[PDB]
């Protein structure tokens, strides 16, 4: 036993309070109960957008590991540049 | 005799409440789980540093934030206060997101 | 230079203004003349609803002109 | 010429809270000068 | 009658007929062939150059094309174009 | 000695000798490879390849023999990859896709 | 001999060297004019200049010693003119502005 | 080792110059140096272009005005142009 | 009948014209004067730049070439003019 311990159903992580903590900072005051799958799926989508090309790097400078930069430039391609990480 | 506040008073307070403070909103072990599982697919036997991790985290939910306000005028327009999946399914489009 | 400002309730009321006064300072007359708030009043004249960051030259009303104004309430 | 009276209609028909902007910021267009 | 200019439209034609040996194409439809390729052409070169400076080298080569494709390219087209690329190198790589 | 062009030794339709002066004339780095104009005249190759077809299709299906405007526009809006890689591009003369709401339409 | 700062002889503070420096070596042109550094350097820091007053005043408004991230974004999106120049950019530890709409407030 | 550039000392040193004893803390430092080094790219490229395109070889400073005039909206272009236009006109009179 | 701030020119048959092809059904009575306002500034935001490139080239008219770049700009591309 070394690693690849595969998990999967990681996407209920997301507890239903932490989508009603966002909500609320969005500033919505009644929610109905179906978002909680909607949401599940759209975050997946954006978040596989990106994972993507933050590898697609990595593999051309032929390393191993993920560092801060490559998710840096990715995020700056689709038009969402994001300050604070080293830019 | 026991207190119960009106119906939906609660959120009124909640929103004040967080639309000040700044830190995060998902406990991280497992949206990093989450993270390392996506990874897998493309080329599995990955190593992050920690730093991307919160990078992404920070991205994930500037998103999800900006997303539910126009999703907020999205049901507004319609003279509801709920939201609904038909509403967020109209904005995701509009912006050509979803298009 | 004099305005006639005619409201709903009958009431046409003069006020003190010059061609330089915005419609939010003739709205702030309003208030000390009347009470009536400004947040909840609109006037209207040459068929078109007045905005506050414009002054009454920029209309271009003349003296003993006739305006209108309607009592919209915004919150509550 | 001028339909003041239908937009009036309108007025009291619709009759709807209304947002615009607030503040002038000509700060920004003065003191950044001398800033 | 001087200043020469130039145009993709010789090849444009050229490659049609490879397909439909029997349609034509205005004028229009050809200028506007010739604007495409000229877009593409440049992003997919400044995508390789950023490509490089990241890594701080000096030179463009293959393998920069090769990712900067998987970058612009969704999905599908981007696995034919790279297969296609791969092979019309390796025969010129032979065929000197 | 005889000369003879690189794309012939490529196989291909496009002109290497352009790709590779423009590579240069452009600062896009400060020495190019070799292989690489190749490669990438290979994928302009291929791409524009297939636009073509996809228009010649639809413009045959509407009883002409040259290609228009109109009908381009009708070959990109029809293959949502390439309707993706064109997201925001305008044709010109290129009209509009055909499409109505359902709840415009009568009754039945 | 007894050299002079670039930016002395400009009377600025941004290292009018380090920037001559990277335009030679970012692949922008083929050669570099004079006063460009210098026009630029002066640019970047009137800007830098603008933004980090208003973040002054916006902290101690707060009545705080230091400055930190939730001030820069309270300080920039309440003024349009730079909200613009920033309307794709992200400052992480961000929060949002405080904002409701008007309707779900209760009657009075 | 393997020294890194920055612009932090040059921040600080402005800032001194409007709020002359208010502090900084660190990532409000990282910030403002990103900020900078996205702002200048989204310029000079800018004007790469604006010179490849009358086939020119050299930037100058009347490009830098005019890529200015077009990414800064408004007043703070009004404001910024005469920034440069003085604090160069002096510098080229005493080298 | 010859006094007519351009603006007026655009007929509100036109814009009912567009809405077709748009694919609407009916039509409220103010949305002539919505398209008026809006039309106008989407087309400062470019003629403002397309001028700034012409002076910067010291020319004296406004080439295709310069639209289209403005065009560029905006995140507008647009194929066929040239370019």
Same mark, same amino acid.
């Given at each position: 036993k ?7 159903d990681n996407?209920q992580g ?5 989508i ?9 005051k009644?929610?109905?109960?179906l978002?909680?799958?909607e949401?599940?799926?759209v ?10 090309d933050?590898? #697609?790097?990595?593999?051309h400078?032929?390393?191993?590991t993920? #560092? ?18 080293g830019g | ?5 009106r ?18 909103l998902?406990?991280?072990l497992? !949206?990093q789980?989450? +993270?390392?599982e996506?990874?897998?697919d !493309?080329?599995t036997?990955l190593? !992050?540093?920690?730093?991307a991790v ?8 500037a998103?999800?934030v900006?997303? !539910?306000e126009?999703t907020?005028?999205?049901?507004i327009?319609?003279?509801? +206060? ?9 904005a ?5 997101e979803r298009? | 230079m004099?305005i006639?400002?005619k409201?709903?309730?009958?009431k046409?009321?003069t006020?003190?203004?010059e061609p330089?006064? @915005?419609?939010?300072?003739? $709205?702030?007359?309003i208030?000390? $003349?009347?009470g ?13 609803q007045?905005?506050d960051? /414009? @002054?009454?030259s920029?209309?271009?009303?003349? $003296?003993?002109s @006739?305006?209108?104004?309607?009592? /919209?309430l /915004?919150?509550? | 010429?001028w339909?003041?009276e239908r937009?009036?209609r309108?007025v009291l028909?619709?009759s ?10 000509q700060h920004?267009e003065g003191?950044?000068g001398?800033? | ?14 490659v049609?007929?490879?397909?439909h ?14 604007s495409?390729v000229?877009?593409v ?6 995508e390789?150059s950023?490509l490089a ?7 463009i080569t293959?393998?920069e094309?090769?990712t900067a ?8 087209l981007?696995?034919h174009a790279?297969?296609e ?6 025969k010129y790589?032979?065929?000197? | ?5 690189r794309?012939?030794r490529? =196989?291909?339709?496009?002109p290497? =000798?352009?790709?590779?002066?423009l590579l240069?004339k ?17 994928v ?7 636009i073509?077809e996809?228009?010649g299709?639809?413009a ?5 023999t040259?290609?228009?405007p ?8 029809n293959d ?6 064109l ?7 290129? =009209?509009?896709?055909?499409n109505?709401?359902?709840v415009?339409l009568?009754?039945?």
């Amino acid at each position: 036993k070394r690693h690849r311990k595969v998990l999967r159903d990681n996407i209920q992580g997301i507890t239903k309070p932490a989508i009603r903590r966002l909500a609320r900072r969005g500033g919505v005051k009644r929610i109905s109960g179906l978002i909680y799958e909607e949401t599940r799926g759209v975050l997946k989508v954006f978040l596989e957008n990106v994972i993507r090309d933050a590898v #697609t790097y990595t593999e051309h400078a032929k390393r191993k590991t993920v #560092t801060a930069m490559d998710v840096v430039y990715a995020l700056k391609r689709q038009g969402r540049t994001l300050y604070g990480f080293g830019g | 005799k026991p207190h119960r506040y009106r119906p939906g008073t609660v959120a009124l307070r909640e929103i004040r409440r967080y639309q000040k403070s700044t830190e995060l909103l998902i406990r991280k072990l497992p !949206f990093q789980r989450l +993270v390392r599982e996506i990874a897998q697919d !493309f080329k599995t036997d990955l190593r !992050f540093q920690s730093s991307a991790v919160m990078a992404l985290q920070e991205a994930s939910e500037a998103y999800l934030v900006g997303l !539910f306000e126009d999703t907020n005028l999205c049901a507004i327009h319609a003279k509801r +206060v709920t939201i609904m999946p038909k509403d967020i399914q109209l904005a995701r489009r509009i912006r050509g997101e979803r298009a | 230079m004099q305005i006639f400002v005619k409201t709903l309730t009958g009431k046409t009321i003069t006020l003190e203004v010059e061609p330089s006064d @915005t419609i939010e300072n003739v $709205k702030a007359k309003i208030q000390d $003349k009347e009470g009536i708030p400004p947040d909840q009043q609109r006037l209207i004249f040459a068929g078109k609803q007045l905005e506050d960051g /414009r @002054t009454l030259s920029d209309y271009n009303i003349q $003296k003993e002109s @006739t305006l209108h104004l309607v009592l /919209r309430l /915004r919150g509550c | 010429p001028w339909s003041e009276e239908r937009v009036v209609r309108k007025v009291l028909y619709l009759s709807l809270k209304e947002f615009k902007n607030s503040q002038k910021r000509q700060h920004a267009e003065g003191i950044a000068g001398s800033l | 009658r001087k200043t020469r200019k130039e145009s993709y439209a010789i090849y444009v034609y050229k490659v049609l007929k490879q397909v439909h040996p029997d349609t034509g194409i205005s004028s229009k439809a050809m200028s506007i062939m010739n604007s495409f390729v000229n877009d593409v052409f440049e992003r997919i070169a400044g995508e390789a150059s950023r490509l490089a400076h990241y890594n701080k080298r000096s030179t463009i080569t293959s393998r920069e094309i090769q990712t900067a494709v998987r970058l612009l390219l969704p999905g599908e087209l981007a696995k034919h174009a790279v297969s296609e690329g791969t092979k019309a190198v390796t025969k010129y790589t032979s065929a000197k | 000695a005889k000369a003879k062009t690189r794309s012939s030794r490529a =196989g291909l339709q496009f002109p290497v =000798g352009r790709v590779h002066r423009l590579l240069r004339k452009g600062n896009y780095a400060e020495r190019v490879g070799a292989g690489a104009p190749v490669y990438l005249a290979a994928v302009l190759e291929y791409l524009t390849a297939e636009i073509l077809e996809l228009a010649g299709n639809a413009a045959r299906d509407n009883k002409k023999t040259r290609i228009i405007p109109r009908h381009l526009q009708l070959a990109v809006r029809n293959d949502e990859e390439l309707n993706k890689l064109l997201g925001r591009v305008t044709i010109a003369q290129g =009209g509009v896709l055909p499409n109505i709401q359902s709840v415009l339409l009568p009754k039945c």
